């Protein structure tokens, strides 16, 4: 079939549609064509979260295998409550409307790209977040992962830590929203360059697409600035 936007050559069979390169191209066209955005980039300090993840390896017992994923989920969950904007499917009746908080994660399968969703109205314990890492992973291997069989997503993460991320996006459909792709990043803040000074100073990377809002670039920058602050000190989430 046809070079680009073709059905023959492609790695996609492949999640809700997407026969192959044709369908993947046609599907992406839907998102890019209806969704006028501009990715936003931020690096955050996880010198302690990485530390905490290693220290709680014992408690895990590979029950879920503590990955940055679940931590990011809980990270985005609380944050979404504080900033309701971009309410998926608009409405709600309870209680307090906003609209629960069901986040999905991309899962590149031999078939193609599935984004399983994990409930969450406004809550996600370590076990609940981790209880689905293993669950979503197993479903992944069994091609039993499709948002259609339980859509209702508010925001989705694309963890490609196996590389790097510095300002990335490509929203999907209005029914589902995209969070934040992950991949790497180092704060140019291990500033110092002295014989005697901490150096340092790591970072994960956080890139988040976002629909044109009434609000603008000022609101967009404030969101990332606060997200920066939140992940240097995750304890701020507790308060």
Swiss-Prot record:
N6-succinyllysine is carried by which residues?
Answer: 65, 139
Where, by residue number, does CoA bind?
A: 53, 67, 158-159, 183
Subunit organization? Part of the pyruvate dehydrogenase complex (PDHc) that is a multi-enzyme complex composed of multiple copies of three enzymes, pyruvate dehydrogenase (subunits PDH1A and PDHB, E1 component), dihydrolipoamide acetyltransferase (DLAT, E2 component), and dihydrolipoamide dehydrogenase (DLD, E3 component) to which is added an additional protein the E3-binding protein (PDHX, E3BP). In terms of structural architecture, the E2 and E3BP components assemble into a 60meric central core with icosahedral symmetry. The central core is decorated with E1 and E3 proteins.
Disease association reads: Primary biliary cirrhosis is a chronic, progressive cholestatic liver disease characterized by the presence of antimitochondrial autoantibodies in patients' serum. It manifests with inflammatory obliteration of intra-hepatic bile duct, leading to liver cell damage and cirrhosis. Patients with primary biliary cirrhosis show autoantibodies against the E2 component of pyruvate dehydrogenase complex. Pyruvate dehydrogenase E2 deficiency: Pyruvate dehydrogenase (PDH) deficiency is a major cause of primary lactic acidosis and neurological dysfunction in infancy and early childhood. In this form of PDH deficiency episodic dystonia is the major neurological manifestation, with other more common features of pyruvate dehydrogenase deficiency, such as hypotonia and ataxia, being less prominent.
Q: Where in the cell is it found?
A: Mitochondrion matrix
Which range is the signal sequence, renumbered to this chain?
Answer: none
Annotated protein name in UniProt: Dihydrolipoyllysine-residue acetyltransferase component of pyruvate dehydrogenase complex, mitochondrial
The family assignment reads:
Belongs to the 2-oxoacid dehydrogenase family.
Extract the coiled-coil ranges from the record: none
Q: Gene symbol?
A: DLAT
**Which residues carry the post-translational modification N6-acetyllysine, per the record?**
58
Active-site residues per Swiss-Prot or TrEMBL entry = 212, 216
Please specify the portion of the entire protein covered by the chain, as first and last position out of its full length: 409 to 647 of 647
Q: What is the lineage of its organism?
A: Eukaryota, Metazoa, Chordata, Craniata, Vertebrata
User: According to its UniProt entry, what is the function of this protein?
Assistant: As part of the pyruvate dehydrogenase complex, catalyzes the transfers of an acetyl group to a lipoic acid moiety. The pyruvate dehydrogenase complex, catalyzes the overall conversion of pyruvate to acetyl-CoA and CO(2), and thereby links cytoplasmic glycolysis and the mitochondrial tricarboxylic acid (TCA) cycle.
> What's the source species for this entry?
Homo sapiens (Human)
